[PDB]
Coordinates of C-alpha atoms and ligand atoms in Angstrom, one line a residue:
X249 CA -22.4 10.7 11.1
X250 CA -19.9 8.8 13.0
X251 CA -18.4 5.4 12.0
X252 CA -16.4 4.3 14.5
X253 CA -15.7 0.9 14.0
X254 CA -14.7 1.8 10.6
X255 CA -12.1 4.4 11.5
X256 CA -8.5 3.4 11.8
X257 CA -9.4 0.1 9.4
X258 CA -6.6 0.8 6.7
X259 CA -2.9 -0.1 7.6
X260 CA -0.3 -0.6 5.1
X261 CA 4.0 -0.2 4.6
X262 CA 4.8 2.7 2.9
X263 CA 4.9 2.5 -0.9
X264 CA 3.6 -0.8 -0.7
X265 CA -0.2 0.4 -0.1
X266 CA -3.5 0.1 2.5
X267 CA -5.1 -2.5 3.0
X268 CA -8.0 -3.5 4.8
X269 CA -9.7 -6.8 6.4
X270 CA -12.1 -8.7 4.4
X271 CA -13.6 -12.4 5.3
X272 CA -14.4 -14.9 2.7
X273 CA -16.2 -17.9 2.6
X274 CA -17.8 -20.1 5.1
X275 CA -16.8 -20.4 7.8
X276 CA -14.7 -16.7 7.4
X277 CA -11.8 -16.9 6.3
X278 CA -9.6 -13.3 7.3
X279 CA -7.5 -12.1 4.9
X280 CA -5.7 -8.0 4.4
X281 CA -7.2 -7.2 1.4
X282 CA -5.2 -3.7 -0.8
X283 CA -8.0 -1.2 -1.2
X284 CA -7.1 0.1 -4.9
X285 CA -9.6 2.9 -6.0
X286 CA -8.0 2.5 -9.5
X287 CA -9.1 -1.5 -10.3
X288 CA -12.2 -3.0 -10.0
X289 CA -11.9 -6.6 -9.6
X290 CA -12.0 -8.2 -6.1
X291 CA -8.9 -10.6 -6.1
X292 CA -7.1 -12.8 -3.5
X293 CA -4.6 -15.2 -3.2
X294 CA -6.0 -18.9 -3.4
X295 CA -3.0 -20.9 -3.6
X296 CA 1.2 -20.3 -1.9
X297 CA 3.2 -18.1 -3.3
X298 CA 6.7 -17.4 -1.5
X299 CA 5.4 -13.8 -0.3
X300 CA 1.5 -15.0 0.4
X301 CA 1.5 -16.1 4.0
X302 CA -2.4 -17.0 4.1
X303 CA -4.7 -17.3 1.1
X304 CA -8.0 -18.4 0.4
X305 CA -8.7 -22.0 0.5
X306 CA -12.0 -22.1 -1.6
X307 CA -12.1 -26.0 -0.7
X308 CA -12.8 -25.2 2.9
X309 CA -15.8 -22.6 2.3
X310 CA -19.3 -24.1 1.9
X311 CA -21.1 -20.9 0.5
X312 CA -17.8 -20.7 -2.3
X313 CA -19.5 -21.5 -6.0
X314 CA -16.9 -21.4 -9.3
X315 CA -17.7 -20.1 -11.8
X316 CA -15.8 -22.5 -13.9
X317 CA -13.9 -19.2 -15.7
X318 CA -10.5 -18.0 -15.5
X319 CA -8.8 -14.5 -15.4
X320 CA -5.6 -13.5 -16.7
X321 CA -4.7 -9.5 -15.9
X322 CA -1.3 -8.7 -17.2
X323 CA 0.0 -5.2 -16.8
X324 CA 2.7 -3.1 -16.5
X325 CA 5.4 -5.7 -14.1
X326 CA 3.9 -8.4 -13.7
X327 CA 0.4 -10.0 -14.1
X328 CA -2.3 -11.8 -11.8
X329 CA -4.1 -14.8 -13.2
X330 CA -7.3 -16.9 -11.2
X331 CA -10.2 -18.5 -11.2
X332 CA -13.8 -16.6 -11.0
X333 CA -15.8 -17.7 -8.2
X334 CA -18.9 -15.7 -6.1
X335 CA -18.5 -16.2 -2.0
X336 CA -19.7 -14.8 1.2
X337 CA -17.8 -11.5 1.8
X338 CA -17.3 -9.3 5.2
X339 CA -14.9 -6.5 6.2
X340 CA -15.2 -7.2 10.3
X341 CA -14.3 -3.5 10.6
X342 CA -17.4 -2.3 7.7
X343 CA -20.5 -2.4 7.5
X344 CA -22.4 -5.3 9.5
X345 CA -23.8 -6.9 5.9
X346 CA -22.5 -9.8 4.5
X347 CA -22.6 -10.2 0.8
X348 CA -22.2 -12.5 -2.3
X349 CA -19.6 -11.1 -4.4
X350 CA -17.5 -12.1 -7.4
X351 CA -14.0 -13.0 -6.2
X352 CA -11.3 -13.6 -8.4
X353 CA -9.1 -16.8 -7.2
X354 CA -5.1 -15.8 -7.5
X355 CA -3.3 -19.0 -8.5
X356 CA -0.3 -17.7 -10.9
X357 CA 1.0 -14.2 -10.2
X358 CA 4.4 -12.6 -11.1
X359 CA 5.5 -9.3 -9.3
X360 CA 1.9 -8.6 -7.9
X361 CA 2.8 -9.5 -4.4
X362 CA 5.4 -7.5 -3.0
X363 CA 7.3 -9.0 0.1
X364 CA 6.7 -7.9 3.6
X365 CA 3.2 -6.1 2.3
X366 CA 1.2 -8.2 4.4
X367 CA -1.7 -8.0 1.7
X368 CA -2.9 -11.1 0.1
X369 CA -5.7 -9.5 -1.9
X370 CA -6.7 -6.7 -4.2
X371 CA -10.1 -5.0 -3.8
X372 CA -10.5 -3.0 -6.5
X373 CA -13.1 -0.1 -6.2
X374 CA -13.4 1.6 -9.2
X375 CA -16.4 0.8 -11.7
X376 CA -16.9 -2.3 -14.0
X377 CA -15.8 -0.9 -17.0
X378 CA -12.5 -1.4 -15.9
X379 CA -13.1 -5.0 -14.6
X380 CA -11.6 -8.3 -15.5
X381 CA -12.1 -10.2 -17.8
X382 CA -14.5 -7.7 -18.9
X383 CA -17.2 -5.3 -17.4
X384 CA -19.9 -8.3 -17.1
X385 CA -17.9 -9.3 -13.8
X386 CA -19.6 -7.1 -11.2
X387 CA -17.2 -5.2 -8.8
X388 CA -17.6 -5.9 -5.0
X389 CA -18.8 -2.5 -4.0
X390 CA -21.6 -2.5 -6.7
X391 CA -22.8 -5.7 -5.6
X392 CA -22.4 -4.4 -2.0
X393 CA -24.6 -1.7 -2.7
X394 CA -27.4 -3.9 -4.5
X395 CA -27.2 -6.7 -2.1
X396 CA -27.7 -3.6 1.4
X397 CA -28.6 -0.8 2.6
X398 CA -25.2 1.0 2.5
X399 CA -25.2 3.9 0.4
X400 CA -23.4 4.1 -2.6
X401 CA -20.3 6.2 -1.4
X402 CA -17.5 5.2 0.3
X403 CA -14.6 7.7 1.9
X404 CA -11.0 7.0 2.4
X405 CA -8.3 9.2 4.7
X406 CA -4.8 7.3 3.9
X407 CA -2.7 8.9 6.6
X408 CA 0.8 7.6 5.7
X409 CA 2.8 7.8 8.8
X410 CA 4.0 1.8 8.7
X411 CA 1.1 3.5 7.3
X412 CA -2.3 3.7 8.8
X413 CA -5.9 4.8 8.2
X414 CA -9.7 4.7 7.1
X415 CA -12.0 3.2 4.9
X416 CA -15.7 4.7 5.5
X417 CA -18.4 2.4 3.9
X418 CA -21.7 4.0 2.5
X419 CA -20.2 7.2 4.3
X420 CA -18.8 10.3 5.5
X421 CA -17.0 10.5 9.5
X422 CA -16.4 14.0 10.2
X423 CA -14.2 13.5 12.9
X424 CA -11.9 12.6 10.2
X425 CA -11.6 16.3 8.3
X426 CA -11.3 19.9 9.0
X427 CA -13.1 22.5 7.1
X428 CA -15.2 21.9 3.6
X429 CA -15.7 19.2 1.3
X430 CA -15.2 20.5 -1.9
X431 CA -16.7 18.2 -5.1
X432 CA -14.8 17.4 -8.3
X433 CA -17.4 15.3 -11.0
X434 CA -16.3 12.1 -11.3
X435 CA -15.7 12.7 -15.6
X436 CA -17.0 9.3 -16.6
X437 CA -17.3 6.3 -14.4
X438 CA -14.5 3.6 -15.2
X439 CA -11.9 4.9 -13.0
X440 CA -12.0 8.1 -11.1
X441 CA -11.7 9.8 -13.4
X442 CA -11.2 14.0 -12.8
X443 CA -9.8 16.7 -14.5
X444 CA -7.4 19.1 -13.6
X445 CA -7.5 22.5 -14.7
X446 CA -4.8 24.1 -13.4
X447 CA -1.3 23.3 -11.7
X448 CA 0.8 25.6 -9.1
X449 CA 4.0 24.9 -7.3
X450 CA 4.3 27.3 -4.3
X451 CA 1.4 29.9 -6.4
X452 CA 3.4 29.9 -9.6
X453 CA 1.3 28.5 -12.7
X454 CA 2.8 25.6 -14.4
X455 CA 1.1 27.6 -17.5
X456 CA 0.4 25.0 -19.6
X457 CA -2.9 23.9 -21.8
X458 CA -4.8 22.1 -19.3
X459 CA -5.5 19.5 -21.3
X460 CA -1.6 18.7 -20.6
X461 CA -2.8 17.9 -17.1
X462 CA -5.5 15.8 -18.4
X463 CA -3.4 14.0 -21.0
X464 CA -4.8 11.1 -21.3
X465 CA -6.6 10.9 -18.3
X466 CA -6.6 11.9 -14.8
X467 CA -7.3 9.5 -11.8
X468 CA -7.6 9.5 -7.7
X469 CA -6.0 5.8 -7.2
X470 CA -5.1 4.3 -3.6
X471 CA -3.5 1.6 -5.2
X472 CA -0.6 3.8 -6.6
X473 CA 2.1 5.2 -4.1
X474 CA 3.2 8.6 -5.8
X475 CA 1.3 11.6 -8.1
X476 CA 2.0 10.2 -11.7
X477 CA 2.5 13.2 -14.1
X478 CA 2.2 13.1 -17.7
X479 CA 5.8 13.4 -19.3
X480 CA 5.3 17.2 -20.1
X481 CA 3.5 18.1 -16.6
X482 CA 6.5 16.0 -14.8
X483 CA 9.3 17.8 -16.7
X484 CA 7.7 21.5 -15.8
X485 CA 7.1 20.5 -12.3
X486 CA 10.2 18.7 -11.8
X487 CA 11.5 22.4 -13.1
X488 CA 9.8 24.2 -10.9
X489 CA 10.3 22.1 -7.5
X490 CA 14.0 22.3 -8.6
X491 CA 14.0 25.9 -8.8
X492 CA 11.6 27.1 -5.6
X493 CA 14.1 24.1 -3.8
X494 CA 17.3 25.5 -5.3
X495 CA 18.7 26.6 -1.6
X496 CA 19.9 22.8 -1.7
X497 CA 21.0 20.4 -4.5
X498 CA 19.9 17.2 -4.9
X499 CA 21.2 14.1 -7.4
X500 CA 19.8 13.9 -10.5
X501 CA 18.7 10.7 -9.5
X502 CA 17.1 11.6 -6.4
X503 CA 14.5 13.8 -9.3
X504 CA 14.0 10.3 -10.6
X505 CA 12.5 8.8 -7.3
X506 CA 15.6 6.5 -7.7
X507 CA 18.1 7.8 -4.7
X508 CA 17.0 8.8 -1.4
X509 CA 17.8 11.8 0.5
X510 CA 18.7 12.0 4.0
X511 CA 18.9 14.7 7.2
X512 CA 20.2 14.7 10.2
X513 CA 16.7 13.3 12.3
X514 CA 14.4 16.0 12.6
X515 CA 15.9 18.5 10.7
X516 CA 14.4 17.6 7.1
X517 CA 14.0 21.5 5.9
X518 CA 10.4 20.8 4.7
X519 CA 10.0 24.7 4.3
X520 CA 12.4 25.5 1.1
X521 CA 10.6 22.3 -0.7
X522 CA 7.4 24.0 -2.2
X523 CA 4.1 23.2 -1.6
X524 CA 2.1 21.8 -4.8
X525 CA -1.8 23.0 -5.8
X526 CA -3.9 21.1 -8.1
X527 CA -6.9 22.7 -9.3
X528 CA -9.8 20.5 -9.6
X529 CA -12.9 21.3 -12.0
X530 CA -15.7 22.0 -9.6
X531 CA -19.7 21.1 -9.7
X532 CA -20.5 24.9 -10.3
X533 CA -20.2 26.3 -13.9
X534 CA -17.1 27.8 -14.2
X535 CA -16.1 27.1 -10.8
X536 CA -13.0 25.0 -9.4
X537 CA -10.8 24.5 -6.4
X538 CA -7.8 23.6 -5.2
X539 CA -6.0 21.0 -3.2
X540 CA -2.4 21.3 -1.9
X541 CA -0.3 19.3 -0.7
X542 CA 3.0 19.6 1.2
X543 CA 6.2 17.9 0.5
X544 CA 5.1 15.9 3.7
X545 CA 2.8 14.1 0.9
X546 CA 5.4 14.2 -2.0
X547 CA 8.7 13.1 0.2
X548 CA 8.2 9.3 0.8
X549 CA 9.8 8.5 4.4
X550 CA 11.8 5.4 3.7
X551 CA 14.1 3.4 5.9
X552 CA 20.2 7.2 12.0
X553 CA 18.5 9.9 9.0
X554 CA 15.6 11.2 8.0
X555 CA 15.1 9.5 4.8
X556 CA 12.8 10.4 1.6
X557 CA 11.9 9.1 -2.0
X558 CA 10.7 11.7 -4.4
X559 CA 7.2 10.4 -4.8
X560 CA 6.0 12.2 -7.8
X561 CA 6.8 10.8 -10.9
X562 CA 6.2 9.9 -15.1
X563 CA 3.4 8.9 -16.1
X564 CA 2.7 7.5 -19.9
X565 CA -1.0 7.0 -19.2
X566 CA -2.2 10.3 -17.9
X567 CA -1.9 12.1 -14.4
X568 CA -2.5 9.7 -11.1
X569 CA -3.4 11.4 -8.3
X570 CA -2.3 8.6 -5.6
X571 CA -1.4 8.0 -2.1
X572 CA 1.0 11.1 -2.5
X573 CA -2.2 13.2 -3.6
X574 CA -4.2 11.6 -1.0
X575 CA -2.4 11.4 2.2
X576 CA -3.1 15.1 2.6
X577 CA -7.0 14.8 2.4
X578 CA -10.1 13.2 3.5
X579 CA -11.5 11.7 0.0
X580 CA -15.3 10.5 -0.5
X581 CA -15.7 8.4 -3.6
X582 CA -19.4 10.1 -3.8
X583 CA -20.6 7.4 -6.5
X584 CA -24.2 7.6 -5.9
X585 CA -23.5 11.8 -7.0
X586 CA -20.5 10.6 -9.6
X587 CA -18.6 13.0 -7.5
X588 CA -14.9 13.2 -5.9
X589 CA -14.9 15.7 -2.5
X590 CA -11.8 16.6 -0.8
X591 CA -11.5 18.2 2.5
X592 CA -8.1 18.3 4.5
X593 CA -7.3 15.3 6.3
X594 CA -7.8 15.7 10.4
X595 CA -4.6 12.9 10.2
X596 CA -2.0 14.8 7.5
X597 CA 2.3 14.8 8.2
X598 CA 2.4 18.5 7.7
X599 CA 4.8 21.1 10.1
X600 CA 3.8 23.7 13.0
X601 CA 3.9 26.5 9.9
X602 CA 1.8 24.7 7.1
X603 CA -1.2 22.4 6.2
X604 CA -2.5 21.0 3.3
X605 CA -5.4 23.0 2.2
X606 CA -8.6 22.3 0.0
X607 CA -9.7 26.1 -0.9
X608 CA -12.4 27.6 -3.5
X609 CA -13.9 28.5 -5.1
X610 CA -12.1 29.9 -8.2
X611 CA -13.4 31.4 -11.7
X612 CA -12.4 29.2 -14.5
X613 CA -13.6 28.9 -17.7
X614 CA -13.4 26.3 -20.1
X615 CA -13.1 24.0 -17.8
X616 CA -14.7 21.4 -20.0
X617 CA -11.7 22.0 -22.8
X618 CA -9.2 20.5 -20.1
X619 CA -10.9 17.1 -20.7
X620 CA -8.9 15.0 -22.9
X621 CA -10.3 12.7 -25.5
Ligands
EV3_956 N1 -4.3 1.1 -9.1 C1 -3.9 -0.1 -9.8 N2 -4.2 -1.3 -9.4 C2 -3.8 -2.1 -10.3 C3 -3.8 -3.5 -10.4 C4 -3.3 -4.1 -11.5 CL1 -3.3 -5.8 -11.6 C5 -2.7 -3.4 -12.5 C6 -2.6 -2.0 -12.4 C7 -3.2 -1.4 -11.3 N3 -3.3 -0.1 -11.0 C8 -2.8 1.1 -11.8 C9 -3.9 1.9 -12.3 C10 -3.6 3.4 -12.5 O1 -2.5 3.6 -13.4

């Protein structure tokens, strides 16, 4: 159908995320809460920190009950640590349910929240096998689900550019795509987990075993800015963008999503960058398709010029199809079918002369011995 008071819920700064509005507690308490498909626990700030300016004040909500149990993620930067607690949740632009949901309490965090964001909360979406402290700890969207009506399935369209968009709740808005919805399974449910079978940059096969791709997993994740490539994918793309881009020459550094590069306003020459094609397995035997983005998607505007980061990047921990990957589409998180669809985002930054695409289907074979394990 349509959800209207659900479009236009997501806004965000670039590289620093989406985010949507959430309530907690009794009476409400509003907070912008960073909707992260690759995380499953629903955290907030609950106590200052010199880039939180609001946070949840559990003391002041009536329906708040601790659950006398702490939570310590560490990761990559930084870490988040909290107290587990259930309260009353709402997202005033969602669904019109209210439901009890675990919430993780924020009190100690180091690099998590990054200044001028304007989140103060992480709502992680993916399933509870990836939850903290452990799987036990339901996600909010499963509880969601169990506690309503709303269907399990959510959809996102992240339209980049400030950044802005939607975050459809137990649906799909068509207003908000152009042509099919094409389905990827959803390989096992922990993160979004899909795999890739096949790689172009402007139509030229990156020719590599798939399972490269794949290597050691492949996610969708909102909460990640840029496509994360695994080291040998990165290197042959990197190769290949350099090449089909070779007209100009840009810094080493600039390759390492380190130094920007700048035009004259209005003249970026999108067209000599190539456009880049990932082929998704499909929910037909021996059937995939493709999504391709522009480097629209995969040139990060940042702040006279025109300004860009390279937005794809290494990866160590498999291939992350992120907001780089997703700004060009329409993606429903089809959890009640353990299914991914893309269709072409009615709200993509492409040019007068080309589009992202989502286009199949396509004979492959094997599709099953791209899977890494
Ligand atoms: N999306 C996302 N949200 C996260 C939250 C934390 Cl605390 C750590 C890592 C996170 N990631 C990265 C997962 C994919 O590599």
């Amino acid at each position: 159908g349509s959800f209207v008071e659900m479009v236009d819920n997501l806004r965000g700064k670039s590289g620093q995320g989406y985010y949507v509005e959430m309530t907690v507690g009794s009476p409400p308490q509003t907070l912008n809460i960073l909707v992260d498909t690759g995380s499953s626990n629903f955290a907030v700030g609950a106590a200052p920190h010199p880039f939180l300016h609001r946070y949840y004040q559990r003391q002041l909500s009536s329906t708040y009950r601790d659950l006398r149990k702490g939570v310590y993620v560490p990761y990559t930067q930084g870490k988040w640590e909290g107290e587990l607690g259930t309260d009353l949740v709402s997202i005033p632009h969602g669904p019109n349910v209210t439901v009890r949901a675990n919430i993780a309490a924020i009190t100690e965090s180091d690099k998590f929240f990054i200044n001028g964001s304007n989140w103060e909360g992480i709502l992680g979406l993916a399933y509870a096998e990836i939850a903290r402290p452990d799987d036990s700890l339901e996600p909010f969207f499963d509880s969601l689900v169990k506690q309503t009506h709303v269907p399990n399935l959510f959809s996102l369209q992240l339209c980049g550019a400030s950044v802005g968009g939607s975050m459809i709740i137990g649906g799909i808005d068509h207003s908000l795509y152009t042509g099919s919805l094409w389905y990827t399974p959803i390989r096992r449910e922990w993160y979004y987990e899909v795999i890739i079978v096949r790689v172009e940059i402007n139509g030229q096969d990156l020719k590599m075993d798939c399972k490269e791709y794949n290597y050691d997993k492949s996610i969708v994740d909102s909460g990640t800015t840029n496509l994360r490539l695994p080291k040998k994918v990165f290197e042959a793309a990197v190769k290949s963008i350099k090449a089909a881009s070779s007209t100009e020459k840009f810094p080493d550094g600039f390759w390492l999503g380190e130094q920007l590069v700048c035009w004259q306003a209005g003249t970026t020459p999108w067209n000599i960058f190539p456009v880049i094609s990932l082929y998704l397995m499909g929910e037909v035997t021996n059937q995939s398709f493709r999504i391709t983005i522009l480097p629209q998607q995969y040139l990060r505007p940042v702040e006279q010029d025109d300004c860009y980061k390279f937005a794809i990047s290494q990866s160590s921990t498999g291939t992350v199809m992120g907001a780089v990957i997703m700004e060009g589409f329409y993606v429903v998180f089809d959890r009640a079918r353990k299914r991914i669809g893309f269709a072409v985002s009615a709200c993509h930054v492409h040019d007068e002369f080309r589009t992202a695409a989502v286009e199949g289907p396509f004979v492959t074979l094997d599709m099953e011995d791209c899977g890494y394990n």
